[PDB]
């Protein structure tokens, strides 16, 4: 992924911003005098393999010149991993930090105000509609979904604060689905969710009250439904459930819950505009429709969900900008 | 778990109130002239056992007098099971339905105002404290929120006597917790899940704040189940397949504790947010979810206390699962008086 942008290279430095999250690392960088912003994401399971990516970026995109490279660490792990970064990059020009929430908002404000065709709405009926934000904006909520959910309130440029988030985020969904279905990739989980029918494992309004009917009353609610002396308890231990239906059920459960909490926070704070960031939606139409419908449903259309083409890079983008 | 209460028995109709949820049926009745309220719960899964309990109640506590028994059904299942009740009780005096929300609030208000030793607070530091709501000394009682947790989560706001309405609830309730843990861990009963949760350590599957930020407190949960995908064309999955793949990589008590915290913290947060929106300080929990389980009650209480900086308070009920059946019972008692 790349964006054309006339960057300022007055410091003659290769700036490399890294958002160090709980599960994923996101980098934003620009080869000097290239006027291209580049974006990359890695799954930092083994910290060794994440340092090795940074080395490869410096080698491939700055001629291996550590002395002309400045690293900006952001994300939740920025202050934590600062010393380790210095241990791993002794020849670096410098390493600085940028606080997580300020990184997110500076990066989001940059994408809203500077980058065209970056903000969009999505639902299954109207499709994707690009919002010409870089051509009303404030106040807004940013719901940043990754390792847990962070929710930030922005009333005007450079004025933001944290409101209550949630531990039921992308890591919960991927962790549950990985363990239950054995899926190894987010794309396998989302492909299954797209085809699945949650009604085989969810209790719907119709299932409680008998024959909106398709509204979910209890996510996964259909599943639970001295010494040995009788037959083994293998009848219930052997009940089987469809992987696509499980994926759709838990994608709905997690996304609808995020959307509700986001709605309630926007209601408390008198906010109409809700941006979703982080690596959660992945541009997937089912996930986006679910989050957008949740906001529309609870507000009867008086609040609006917005998505971002570079949703996963908000924090690293803000950190990149803080360098120069 | 009976209660003494001086009832007027009217024309001596034996009122049998049933709250039928997604998985449980809750029954309230009073033998004629006994001045005792009696309570029983049974799963609805096996219909013959559910109906057999109601027959046993009539035979043992109303001398087998079907002709003077009135069944009043409430809860979501009151519609789905109406024909079953008609089929199973052909000699009965009558069968009626009572609206779900009205049942819950009429029952809760009765317990709050009339029944001693019924409302209590609990957390790990303070222990259990009984609240004397039924004694002398409205501005302390109303307004309040009822968070009724069964398969899903229903949330009702009560501003004053007879003034109540529904607000946004949640599909992540007890059915979600039970469904996930029974599939993943093979727990046989809700009580076994709770015992396993009591023993577990969620830090082996959850990402804590300290995991991400180093040194919200460090021990707070940042990502429920967040260590699992990190450390991790078949159509069907089962417990056996999950178990045969996981292979003790993640321990069942740790999984139970993590998801108990995740579901409970989430319910507490949504309750807090609805109470914030509606400027309510008193939050009652109803249903079959807390079950007097200290860890669950502490978790819910801490969530409300945390987000509100101490200004809101979680309340629990000794007869939490019976609110709707109690409301229905009171309506039928009024009709037969
Ligand atoms: Mg610094």
From Swiss-Prot, chain A:
Ranges annotated as spanning the membrane: none
Principal subcellular localization: cytoplasm
Pathway noted in the entry: Cofactor biosynthesis; coenzyme A biosynthesis; CoA from (R)-pantothenate: step 1/5
Organism whose genome encodes this protein: Saccharomyces cerevisiae (strain ATCC 204508 / S288c) (Baker's yeast)
Gene that encodes the chain: CAB1
Task performed by this protein: Plays a role in the physiological regulation of the intracellular CoA concentration.
Entry EC no(s): 2.7.1.33
CDD domains per UniProt: ASKHA_NBD_PanK-II_Pank4 (cd24123)
Cellular localisation: Cytoplasm; Nucleus
Top-level taxonomic group: Eukaryota
Catalytic activity: (R)-pantothenate + ATP = (R)-4'-phosphopantothenate + ADP + H(+)
InterPro entries in the record: ATPase_NBD, Type_II_PanK
Record PANTHER family: 4'-PHOSPHOPANTETHEINE PHOSPHATASE (PTHR12280:SF20), PANTOTHENATE KINASE (PTHR12280)
Note: Present with 6190 molecules/cell in log phase SD medium.
GO molecular function terms noted in the UniProt entry: ATP binding; pantothenate kinase activity
The family this protein is said to belong to: Belongs to the type II pantothenate kinase family.
Protein name: Pantothenate kinase CAB1
Description of activity control: Regulated by feedback inhibition by malonyl-CoA.
Keywords tagged on the record: ATP-binding, Coenzyme A biosynthesis, Cytoplasm, Kinase, Nucleotide-binding, Nucleus, Transferase
Keyword field contains Acetylation: no
GO biological process terms held by the UniProt record: coenzyme A biosynthetic process; ergosterol metabolic process
Cystine crosslinks: none
GO CC annotation: cytoplasm; cytosol; nucleus
UniProtKB/Swiss-Prot annotation, chain B:
Domain of life, source organism: Eukaryota
Keyword Repeat part of the UniProt annotation: no
Any single Gene Ontology cellular-component annotation: cytoplasm
Documented activity regulation: Regulated by feedback inhibition by malonyl-CoA.
Any GO BP annotation: ergosterol metabolic process
Compartment(s) of residence: Cytoplasm; Nucleus
EC number: 2.7.1.33
Major localization listed first in the record, in broad terms: cytoplasm
Chain ranges passing through the membrane: none
Enzymatic reactions: (R)-pantothenate + ATP = (R)-4'-phosphopantothenate + ADP + H(+)
Pathway info: Cofactor biosynthesis; coenzyme A biosynthesis; CoA from (R)-pantothenate: step 1/5
InterPro entries (alphabetical): ATPase_NBD, Type_II_PanK
Keywords recorded for this protein, A-Z: ATP-binding, Coenzyme A biosynthesis, Cytoplasm, Kinase, Nucleotide-binding, Nucleus, Transferase
GO molecular function, one term: pantothenate kinase activity
Presence of keyword Oxidoreductase: no
Note: Present with 6190 molecules/cell in log phase SD medium.
PANTHER family on file: 4'-PHOSPHOPANTETHEINE PHOSPHATASE (PTHR12280:SF20), PANTOTHENATE KINASE (PTHR12280)
Role this protein plays: Plays a role in the physiological regulation of the intracellular CoA concentration.
Family: Belongs to the type II pantothenate kinase family.
Official protein name in the record: Pantothenate kinase CAB1
Organism this protein belongs to: Saccharomyces cerevisiae (strain ATCC 204508 / S288c)
């Amino acid at each position: 992924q790349e964006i054309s942008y006339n960057c300022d290279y007055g410091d003659n430095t290769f700036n490399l911003a890294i958002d160090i999250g709980g599960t994923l690392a996101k980098v934003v960088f620009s080869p000097i005098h290239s006027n291209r912003l580049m974006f990359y994401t890695i799954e930092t399971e083994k910290i060794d393999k994440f340092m090795e990516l940074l080395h490869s970026i410096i080698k491939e995109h700055n001629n291996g010149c550590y002395r002309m490279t400045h690293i900006i660490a952001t994300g939740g792990g920025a202050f934590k991993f600062y010393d380790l970064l210095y241990e791993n990059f002794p020849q670096i020009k410098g390493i600085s930090r940028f606080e997580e929430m300020e990184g997110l908002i500076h990066g989001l404000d940059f994408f809203i105000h500077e980058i065209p065709d970056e903000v969009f709405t999505y639902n299954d009926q109207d499709g994707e509609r690009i919002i010409p934000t870089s051509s009303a904006i404030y106040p807004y909520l940013l719901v940043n979904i990754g390792s847990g959910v962070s929710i930030l309130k922005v009333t005007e440029p450079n004025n933001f604060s944290r409101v209550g988030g949630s531990s039921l985020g992308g890591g919960t969904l991927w962790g549950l689905l990985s363990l239950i279905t054995g899926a190894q990739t987010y794309d396998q989980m989302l492909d299954w969710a797209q085809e699945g029918d949650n009604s085989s494992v969810d209790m719907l309004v119709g299932d409680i009250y008998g024959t909106k009917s398709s509204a979910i009353a209890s996510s996964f609610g259909k599943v639970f439904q001295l010494y040995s002396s009788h037959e083994s308890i293998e009848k219930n231990n052997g009940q089987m459930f469809k992987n696509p239906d499980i994926c759709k059920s838990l994608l709905f459960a997690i996304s609808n819950n995020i959307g509700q909490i986001a709605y309630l926070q926007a209601k408390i704070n008198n906010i109409q505009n809700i941006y979703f960031g982080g690596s959660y939606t992945r541009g997937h139409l089912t996930t986006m429709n679910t989050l957008s419908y949740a906001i529309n449903f609870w507000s009867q259309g008086s609040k609006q969900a917005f998505f971002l083409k570079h949703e996963g890079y908000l924090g690293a983008m803000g950190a990149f900008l803080s360098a120069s």
